[PDB]
What we know:
Blueprint: H1 17-32, H2 36-50, H3 70-82, H4 86-92, H5 95-104, H6 111-119, H7 125-129, H8 137-144, H9 146-149, E1 153-154, H10 155-172, E2 177-180, H11 182-185, E3 190-191, E4 193-199, H12 209-219, E5 223-225, E6 237-246, E7 249-259, H13 265-273, H14 276-290, E8 293-294, E9 299-301, E10 306-307, H15 313-319
Parallel strand pairs: 4-7
Antiparallel strand pairs: 1-3, 2-4, 5-6, 6-7, 8-9, 9-10
The protein binds three DNA strands through residues 3, 30, 35-42, 44-45, 66-72, 107-110, 112-113, 136, 138-139, 182, 193, 195, 227-228, 232, 235-239, 256, 258, 271-272, 274, 276, 279-284, 286-288, 293-297.
Cofactor: Mg(2+)
Keywords: DNA damage, DNA recombination, DNA repair, DNA-directed DNA polymerase, Magnesium, Metal-binding, Nucleotidyltransferase, Nucleus, Phosphoprotein, Transferase
GO molecular function: DNA binding; DNA-directed DNA polymerase activity; metal ion binding
Amino acid sequence: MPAYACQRPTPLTHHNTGLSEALEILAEAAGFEGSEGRLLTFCRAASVLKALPSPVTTLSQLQGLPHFGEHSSRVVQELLEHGVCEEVERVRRSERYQTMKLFTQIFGVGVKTADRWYREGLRTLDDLREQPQKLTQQQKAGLQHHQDLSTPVLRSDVDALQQVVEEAVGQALPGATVTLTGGFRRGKLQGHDVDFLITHPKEGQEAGLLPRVMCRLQDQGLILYHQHQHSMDAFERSFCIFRLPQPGSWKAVRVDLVVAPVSQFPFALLGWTGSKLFQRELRRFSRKEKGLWLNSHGLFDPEQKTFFQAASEEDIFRHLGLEYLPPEQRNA
DNA sequence: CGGCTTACG
DNA sequence: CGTA
DNA sequence: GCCG
Length: 332
Ligand SMILES: [Cl-]
Ligand SMILES: [K+]
């Protein structure tokens, strides 16, 4: 089993959910305590289990797997022997973990913000609503719409959303296209947000497109929160909150809109499709194993000072020496 | 031992 | 810092 | 926490 998540297919459905979820609890807790290295190892170990074809039943099966060492093997060992791991259970029942998970699940709140609020004695969402001076406008929106934003987004919502996004994009720029990315492109049936990638076949036509799209959406009354203020002034990404029509009502939905020039489209498609761990492992592999710098704009050779002109995601995998993984196999 | 994705708002 |  |  190879060491990078971008070297192995990881499907939606896998066989070690109980073991994976426990390691991901420890990964989350490591992040809450500011140990980004420990988070990564626990996430990578959990990902290794997701790629296995069969359930792990004996400790010997962990031999030869990357990212498994004394600590992660002890966690699996306890789960195999007793069905629970005492370290994991102590974490999930701890007030620190429950409060940090509660606060970091708010749109606009990360680990450092949640940790500050925790040290100040805050424990519940109502504690936050009673301290509005501690909140950015972004966090006020995440708190105001928290119940809706914690409701899982379904495929039915995605199709309705893509319709209204395509309408606004079409009114903003003839011939522009809209591509669903993110978890739903990977085959997930639920999500916490919906990601769309927007481009135009003619390079340059997409300049200034996202503000025109956001204005069309605001005019349809569809935007509840938007981070940029528009009638640097230009922007190409918007992580907004939509007022999605429902039968006789509406529901707030997190939506990401990204504009990219068509020359960068395969890199943008690869980037925004995820998963998050897949992307980190792919970019790490690119830099550390191939000496190339990858992001959502391109693939840069710092020695030749040139960008690789890709026409497809397959082109990028091939240039990196990787077997192609379709999006449904990028669920690391 | 040091590294751990890499951008934009 | 937050977003992905 | 684990790898290079
Ligand atoms: Cl990027
Ligand atoms: K958050």
